[PDB]
């Protein structure tokens, strides 16, 4: 009945600020952690419990840790508006960064900070009675996010065992780039994400920039817009635990319906009524129209085109004014289309969810206010095409050992490059083989 | 037909305080000792638990014993504490230290003579004496040592009366003390030789009664002691009120014990239900009998389903037909026939009393002799064997003076008790 | 627009009073500013009990 969030590095902490801003405003906790309640025992709710615990003085505090190796971003959280919301032990900061080296984070520096993080996560898990998963936010392009995220997922996987770990990951965009060494860190990261994650959602900033230019009317978007969209998606997926509805969906139902084989756990995400205020005046927003919207590739938050692959499973979460008969009519119409294809071994391709709470509006936001929305997470073979672009950049740089001396000097064997590159080749072949139609006797 | 009660140690003193509250309520005795009741039926048997002092007041025939006076100051501070005779409180000046040998040999022998003097003064005052009733824990220090010492001396001095004990024994799951297995083993060795009938209670079973059946939000030891006080006051109800089919402690013993060592029994009381649920189900003899045999309502961790009943007794309180009692007890004997020992043709005795406990129109208390009690003793013996093989804490007992041979004798006697129960528990087709 | 409650089938019509009865609802806190669709679990989970 609760979930714990782990935020790593710069992207993960900045996305965390938007997420906790939304969850506070949606439940109603004030910035100092106070919330009025009812004075008579028995007339009270519990929806906050998934994300907040209350102290005996009535302050609310959230189930999250913020991890960084440089102090600046955590000190910015400490001096901002939400200073009193977080417990000071939860905001953990080291002295110096991993300098874009996965090797520095994994072997030299994250090894010093990892035990404090594990002690805080243990102190959180002891204050729970129905923990049903970890949510992790990180980018695989940077040094501390890749190295410490991998090391921490390995340690969590040994200590907690069967408990689920769901990751939201900012992967390196296919042509927009921020640092030269991004391919090495992303390749070395993906091996750990392969072994130690139950479902992994992939995001690219280039797709969210395209989405904010095309659907919203923003000429100069910045990271706060992307982080607010990610927060809305996470709020939609976790709404099924927090509010009343016709068809609830527990986090184990996602894994049961969306994952066909234990390695095939990388999923695409999209959100339907991303629209500006001007458009709301001229657009109807029926169930079937937003269901048709979720399948347009212009709606995706990862730069991949699903028409180049086959769908294995789709999970559709409806929140707001929806009636099950309209969801059934929409899904039957989608199933009729010939540009939408499912693997022939998956005839019943859809999972549905219906919740009564409509999406919340944030004071500085850019999305319009709407009475209903649908969010989809889906598994498709097209994702194999996303890995190939990073692997080509790895082969280009590694042919001349362009920067390897940093990694070898900071403690890593050169063999790790070849192992990781072979593992990504095998993952690509797995997604090619699982997606092949039918078979033959010879 | 007068009963003398003995309460020893903190647990015993607390249960005794709750028992005397329940008994004083049923006979309408004010905490000042003045009779304020509303029917002559209350007066005609008041002698059974109270002696009469001059000018109306009544004082209860009980001896309070403990090795440290903290509990006695607590009971004197309690709501009914004033009723007790001042000369009846006997206490020492240092604690038992949770050690059986300390409670039995060194500080025990110093005080025991004053306790025997008070018990003899109380016994010789009765016109006709019925059995003694003793409450104590077996896991403690003064409770186990001085309780078994006093039981041995009273059994030497009054061998023709009845000796009845209610005893609480440490849970393997919810224990307060590390050296519990030694004290428990030595106490069970003393009881199987000394006792005439012994009832055993697990605090874990009373917690499961409170949490599952009564749905109490914040239970306390007072509730646990009320369940115990309810069964103890229920067993004696036919001794002190009229009824269609009278019963007595000796009659219970004669019908329950087939062979002299098999005298350990399980207890239950049927009408238990939470204040929210009580509006949804009326009490009736089929409902009381069904709850009465339900293991959820039994006060020990061992389950009857792993053994077989040799004998059982049910005492009913209230205005009811004899046909429903007879046909219900026949139906329960017929429906669960595999759990009843086949070489006894009918295992259940029934009894009916007209006056129910206050606030209930009817109630029943259940006493059962079942072989599943062997599982409790086996578990205690296992923990003892783990500790004894490694000499884990023996120097305390040996420093007090105990021979290790005492430990080997007590282990052998309990093992033979477990074997005797185990032969009768299982079927033999041959 | 940041504080008003959207008109739904499950909230009913506010200016006529009609409200359809459907499954999946729970008792409602009467405090101001709280959503009526927040989960209620006092009957099945007595919080802070022991």
């Amino acid at each position: 009945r609760e979930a714990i969030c782990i935020h790593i590095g710069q992207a993960g902490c900045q996305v965390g600020n938007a997420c906790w801003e939304l969850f506070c405003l949606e439940h109603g906790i004030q910035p100092d952690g106070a919330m009025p309640s009812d004075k008579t025992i028995g007339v009270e709710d519990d929806a906050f419990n998934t994300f907040f615990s209350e102290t005996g003085a009535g302050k609310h505090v959230p189930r999250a840790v913020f991890l960084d190796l440089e102090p600046t971003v955590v000190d910015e959280v400490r001096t901002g508006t939400y200073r009193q919301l977080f417990h000071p032990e939860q905001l953990i900061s080291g002295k110096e960064d991993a300098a874009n080296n996965y090797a520095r984070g994994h072997y030299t520096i994250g090894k010093e900070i990892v035990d404090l993080c594990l002690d805080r996560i243990r102190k959180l898990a002891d204050n729970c009675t129905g923990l049903q998963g970890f949510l992790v936010y990180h980018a695989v392009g940077g040094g501390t996010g890749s190295g410490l995220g991998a090391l921490l997922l390995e340690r969590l996987s040994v200590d907690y065992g069967k408990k689920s770990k769901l990751g939201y990951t900012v992967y390196p965009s296919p042509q927009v780039s921020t640092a030269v060494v991004e391919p090495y860190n992303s390749v070395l990261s993906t091996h750990s994400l392969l072994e130690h994650t139950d479902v992994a959602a992939m995001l690219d900033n280039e797709a969210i920039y395209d989405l904010t230019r095309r659907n919203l009317d923003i000429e100069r978007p910045t990271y706060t817009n992307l982080n607010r969209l990610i927060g809305q998606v996470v709020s939609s997926l976790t709404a099924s635990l927090r509010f009343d509805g016709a068809l609830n969906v527990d986090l184990t139902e996602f894994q049961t319906n969306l994952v066909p084989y234990p390695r095939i756990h990388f999923v695409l995400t999209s959100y339907a009524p991303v629209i500006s205020a001007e458009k709301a005046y001229h657009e109807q927003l029926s169930v079937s129209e937003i269901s048709n919207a979720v399948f347009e590739p212009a709606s995706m938050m990862t730069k991949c085109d699903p028409r180049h692959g086959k769908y294995m499973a789709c999970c559709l979460m409806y929140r707001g004014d929806v009636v099950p008969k309209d969801v059934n009519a929409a899904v039957a119409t989608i199933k009729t289309k010939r540009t939408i294809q499912f693997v022939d071994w998956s005839p019943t391709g859809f999972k549905c969810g219906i919740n009564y709470q409509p999406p919340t509006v944030v004071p500085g936001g850019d999305l319009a206010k709407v009475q209903r929305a649908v969010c989809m997470i889906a598994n498709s073979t097209a994702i194999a095409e996303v890995f190939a672009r990073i692997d080509h950049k790895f082969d280009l740089m590694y042919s001349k050992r362009a920067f390897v001396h940093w990694y070898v000097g900071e403690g890593m064997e050169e063999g790790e490059f070849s192992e990781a590159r072979e593992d990504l080749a095998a993952l690509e072949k797995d997604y090619e083989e699982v997606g092949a139609e039918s078979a033959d006797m010879d | 037909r007068e009963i003398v009660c003995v309460q020893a140690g903190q647990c015993g003193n607390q249960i005794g305080s709750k028992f005397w509250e329940v008994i004083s309520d049923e006979h309408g005795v004010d905490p000042t000792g003045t009779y304020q009741g509303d029917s002559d039926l209350q007066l005609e048997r008041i002698n059974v638990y109270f002696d009469e002092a001059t000018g109306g007041r009544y004082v209860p025939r009980s001896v309070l014993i403990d090795l440290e006076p903290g509990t006695m100051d607590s009971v004197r501070a309690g709501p009914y504490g004033q009723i007790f005779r001042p000369d009846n409180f006997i206490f020492g000046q240092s604690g038992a230290g949770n050690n059986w040998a300390k409670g039995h040999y060194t500080e025990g022998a110093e005080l025991i003579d004053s306790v025997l003097d008070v018990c003899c003064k109380e016994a010789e005052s009765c016109d006709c004496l019925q059995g003694f009733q003793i409450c104590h824990s077996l896991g403690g220090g003064t409770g186990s040592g001085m309780g078994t010492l006093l039981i041995s001396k009273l059994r030497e001095q009054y061998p023709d009366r009845i000796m009845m004990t209610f005893s609480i024994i440490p849970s393997p799951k919810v224990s307060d003390t590390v050296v519990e297995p030694y004290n428990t083993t030595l106490s069970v060795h003393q009881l199987v030789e000394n006792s005439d009938e012994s009832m055993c209670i697990d605090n874990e079973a009373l917690y499961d009664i409170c949490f599952r059946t009564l749905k109490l939000t914040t239970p306390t030891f007072g509730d646990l002691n009320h369940l115990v006080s309810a069964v103890v006051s229920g067993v004696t109800c036919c001794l002190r009120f009229p009824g269609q089919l009278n019963s007595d402690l000796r009659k219970l013993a004669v019908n329950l014990v087939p062979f002299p060592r098999l005298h350990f029994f399980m207890m239950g009381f049927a009408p238990l239900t939470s204040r929210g649920s009580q509006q949804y189900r009326g009490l009736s003899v089929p409902e009381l009998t069904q709850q009465m045999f339900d293991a959820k309502n039994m006060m020990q961790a061992a389950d009857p389903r792993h053994g077989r009943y040799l004998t059982a007794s049910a005492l009913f309180r209230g205005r009811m037909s004899t046909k429903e009692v007879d046909e219900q007890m026949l139906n329960v004997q017929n429906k669960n026939s595999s759990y009843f020992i086949e070489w006894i043709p009918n295992n259940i005795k029934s009894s009916v009393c007209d006056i129910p406990p206050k606030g209930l129109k009817m109630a029943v208390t259940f006493i059962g002799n079942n072989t599943c009690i062997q599982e409790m003793f086996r578990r205690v013996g296992e923990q003892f064997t783990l500790m004894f093989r490694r000499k884990a804490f023996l120097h305390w007992y040996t420093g007090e003076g105990m021979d290790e041979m005492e430990f080997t004798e007590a282990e052998s006697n309990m093992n033979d008790l477990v074997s005797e129960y185990q032969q009768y528990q299982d079927a033999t087709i041959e | 627009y940041l504080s008003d409650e959207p008109i739904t089938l499950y909230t009913g019509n506010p200016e006529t009073g009609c409200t359809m009865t459907v499954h999946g609802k729970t008792p409602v806190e009467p405090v101001e500013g709280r959503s009526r669709f927040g989960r209620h679990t006092y009957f099945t989970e007595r919080k802070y009990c022991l």
């Binding site: - | 501070a77 914040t218 | 022991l50």
Partner: peptide, 26 residues
């Protein structure tokens, strides 16, 4: 008197522990 003070302390404790939340984290 000692008895009066002991009874008063016990009564106030019972009044405090009646609320489960206060028993847990007061």
């Amino acid at each position: 008197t000692t008895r009066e003070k002991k009874r008063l302390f016990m009564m106030q404790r019972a009044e405090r522990l009646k609320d489960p939340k206060m028993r847990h984290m007061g």
